[PDB]
Amino acid sequence: LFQTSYTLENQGSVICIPNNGQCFCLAWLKSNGTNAEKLAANILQWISFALSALCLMFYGYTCGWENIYVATIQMIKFIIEYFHSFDEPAVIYSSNGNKTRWLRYASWLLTCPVILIHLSNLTGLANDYNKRTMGLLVSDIGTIVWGTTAALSKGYVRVIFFLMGLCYGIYTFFNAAKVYIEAYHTVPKGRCRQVVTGMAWLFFVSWGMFPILFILGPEGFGVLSRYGSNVGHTIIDLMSKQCWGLLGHYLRVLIHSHILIHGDIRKTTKLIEVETLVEDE
Amino acid sequence: LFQTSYTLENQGSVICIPNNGQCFCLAWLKSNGTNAEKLAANILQWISFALSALCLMFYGYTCGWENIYVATIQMIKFIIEYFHSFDEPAVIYSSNGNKTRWLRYASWLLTCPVILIHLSNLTGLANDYNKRTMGLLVSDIGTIVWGTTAALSKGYVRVIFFLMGLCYGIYTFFNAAKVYIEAYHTVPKGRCRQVVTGMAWLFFVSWGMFPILFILGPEGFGVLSRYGSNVGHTIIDLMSKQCWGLLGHYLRVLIHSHILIHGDIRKTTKLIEVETLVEDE
Ligand SMILES: *C/C=C(C)/C=C/C=C(C)/C=C/C1=C(C)CCCC1(C)C
Numbered sequence: 001l002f003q004t005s006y007t008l009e010n011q012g013s014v015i016c017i018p019n020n021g022q023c024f025c026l027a028w029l030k031s032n033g034t035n036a037e038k039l040a041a042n043i044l045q046w047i048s049f050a051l052s053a054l055c056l057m058f059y060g061y062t063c064g065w066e067n068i069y070v071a072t073i074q075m076i077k078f079i080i081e082y083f084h085s086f087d088e089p090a091v092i093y094s095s096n097g098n099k100t101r102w103l104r105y106a107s108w109l110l111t112c113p114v115i116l117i118h119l120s121n122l123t124g125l126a127n128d129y130n131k132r133t134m135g136l137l138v139s140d141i142g143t144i145v146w147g148t149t150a151a152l153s154k155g156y157v158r159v160i161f162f163l164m165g166l167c168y169g170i171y172t173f174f175n176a177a178k179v180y181i182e183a184y185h186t187v188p189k190g191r192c193r194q195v196v197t198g199m200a201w202l203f204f205v206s207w208g209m210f211p212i213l214f215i216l217g218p219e220g221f222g223v224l225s226r227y228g229s230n231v232g233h234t235i236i237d238l239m240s241k242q243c244w245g246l247l248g249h250y251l252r253v254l255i256h257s258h259i260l261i262h263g264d265i266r267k268t269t270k271l272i273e274v275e276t277l278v279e280d281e
Numbered sequence: 282l283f284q285t286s287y288t289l290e291n292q293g294s295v296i297c298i299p300n301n302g303q304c305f306c307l308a309w310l311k312s313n314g315t316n317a318e319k320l321a322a323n324i325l326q327w328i329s330f331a332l333s334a335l336c337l338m339f340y341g342y343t344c345g346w347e348n349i350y351v352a353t354i355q356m357i358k359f360i361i362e363y364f365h366s367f368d369e370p371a372v373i374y375s376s377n378g379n380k381t382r383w384l385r386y387a388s389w390l391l392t393c394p395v396i397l398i399h400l401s402n403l404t405g406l407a408n409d410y411n412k413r414t415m416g417l418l419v420s421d422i423g424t425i426v427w428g429t430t431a432a433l434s435k436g437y438v439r440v441i442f443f444l445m446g447l448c449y450g451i452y453t454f455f456n457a458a459k460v461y462i463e464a465y466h467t468v469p470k471g472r473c474r475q476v477v478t479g480m481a482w483l484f485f486v487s488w489g490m491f492p493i494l495f496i497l498g499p500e501g502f503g504v505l506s507r508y509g510s511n512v513g514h515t516i517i518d519l520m521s522k523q524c525w526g527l528l529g530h531y532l533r534v535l536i537h538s539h540i541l542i543h544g545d546i547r548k549t550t551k552l553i554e555v556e557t558l559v560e561d562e
């Protein structure tokens with residue numbers, strides 16, 4: 001790792017370290033949090049792992065490849081997180097004293113665009129999508145790029161890249177809302193419109209907490225510890241990925257049964273015009 | 282920045298640094314390269330900047346939003362690269378002695394998926410694309426995620442994530458080849474099939490050099506310096522982005538004139554079946 005043993009000299013003005021080839025920085029030696037927050041984070045890690053495990057078991061029984069991918073990444077991430085939750089480069093101890101959780105932002109790069117692809121095809125009916133789908137993806141990747149760059153930076157540079165990620169996040173939400181709106185008027189009138197509304201609530205609430213936790217954590221004003229920031233991120237990761245994929249799976253199941261019982265019947269409704277699934281011709 | 286002045290003590294077994302709050306590591310003080318390689322890198326930076334500037338001027342005269350985006354990111358990157366080419370976090374000096382060019386991998390996260398979106402719609406004829414487009418994007422993002430994780434890691438961990446990025450890169454090339462193949466038999470028989478073949482050559486050659494430069498550079502066996510690695514990356518960035526977008530723009534221009542002179546005429550050809558643009562009905 002890095003140097004953790006040192007001697008102060010010359011009345012606290014000189015620091016002497018062993019010439020063992022390791023790197024040294026006092027900022028890296030600050031506490032990550034309390035032992036209660038550590039154990040609380042370790043508890044939610046198994047809860048999210050057991051869910052991801054029970055999801056892969058459940059998903060194994062068209063193809064919901066989106067849910068399989070983020071669940072495979074999720075439990076692979078837990079295997080990495082169980083052994084090296086704070087080692088390099090799972091946590092990047094950079095030369096400016098920062099601690100940046102690359103394990104979190106890498107998993108966002110792996111899973112967040114896949115969820116928006118699922119959002120771009122909520123019904124799952126073959127090659128649907130739209131041209132705004134590329135807009136949802138180009139903006140979300142930039143959101144995580146600026147957020148990672150802001151978490152790595154300090155001072156004004158961090159604020160600049162945080163506001164750049166915030167503008168990309170605003171473009172992501174608005175385009176996502178218009179996807180949820182069209183999907184609401186496309187799915188049948190029954191219980192399908194219920195989960196579509198429920199998926200939207202889980203989406204904007206969980207996705208909205210990530211910029212909130214960025215401000216409250218060490219990357220911001222430090223009202224949360226590093227262990228405290230891992231607890232909140234696990235909660236909204238459990239909502240935005242495991243629970244959101246469960247509902248999206250439940251929606252596509254209700255769609256497939258509707259298409260097999262009543263056929264694929266479309267009634268054009270004006271909003272933009274949507275081909276709504278109906279029961280009778 | 283970090284500590285660059287230090288005193289050796291106790292016959293080279295103790296390193297003493299000022300207690301100024303800065304971080305210290307001997308590995309961060311290694312040379313980036315020779316002054317000739319520095320000036321050679323600075324020369325290609327203006328050449329790629331002037332091209333990106335002359336491209337934005339040229340592009341300003343459906344909508345080729347893909348070329349506009351990577352060109353805007355390219356010259357914004359040059360502004361960042363001109364002032365802080367080796368500052369934090371443009372270059373991440375991590376606690377394990379590594380130097381990782383996050384400026385390069387962040388620009389890849391911003392531009393590489395946008396190019397594959399352009400590849401997914403070479404003709405530019407409205408909402409074309411396919412379902413493999415999401416496969417091209419999910420695999421390429423993972424490629425850069427594993428490559429960044431490998432560049433941040435050391436030893437066996439670096440090799441694991443490099444091979445994980447290599448498998449994602451293999452999936453990316455094969456799906457990209459089938460896109461180029463279908464595009465060749467879809468565009469008209471004239472000069473359009475010429476640039477389509479030319480775009481494919483620039484693609485796999487430039488994209489193929491990035492794993493090659495990863496091995497030859499500091500992230501690999503160190504046959505290239507850090508300045509030497511920046512020169513090679515600039516050359517293949519100039520090919521894969523500026524030149525590839527110029528040809529893709531030239532292709533979409535030749536397609537639009539063909540659609541306005543001869544109309545949109547399709548003749549189904551078997552390969553998979555493709556609707557080929559023809560002149561006469
Ligand atoms: C499963 C994890 C998910 C869905 C994370 C989503 C995270 C965001 C939408 C983060 C957004 C941010 C901004 C919009 C402002 C810039 C910094 C943030 C990146 C973290």
Ligand SMILES: *C/C=C(C)/C=C/C=C(C)/C=C/C1=C(C)CCCC1(C)C
Binds near residue numbers: 427429447489492521
């Ligand atoms: C404009 C820059 C581009 C198009 C860069 C493309 C880079 C790659 C395709 C890199 C691929 C890599 C692998 C396939 C193995 C893992 C490490 C690499 C990421 C750098």
Ligand SMILES: [Cl-]
Binds near residue numbers: 091099100101226
């Ligand atoms: Cl952390």
Ligand SMILES: [Cl-]
Binds near residue numbers: 372380382507
């Ligand atoms: Cl570098």
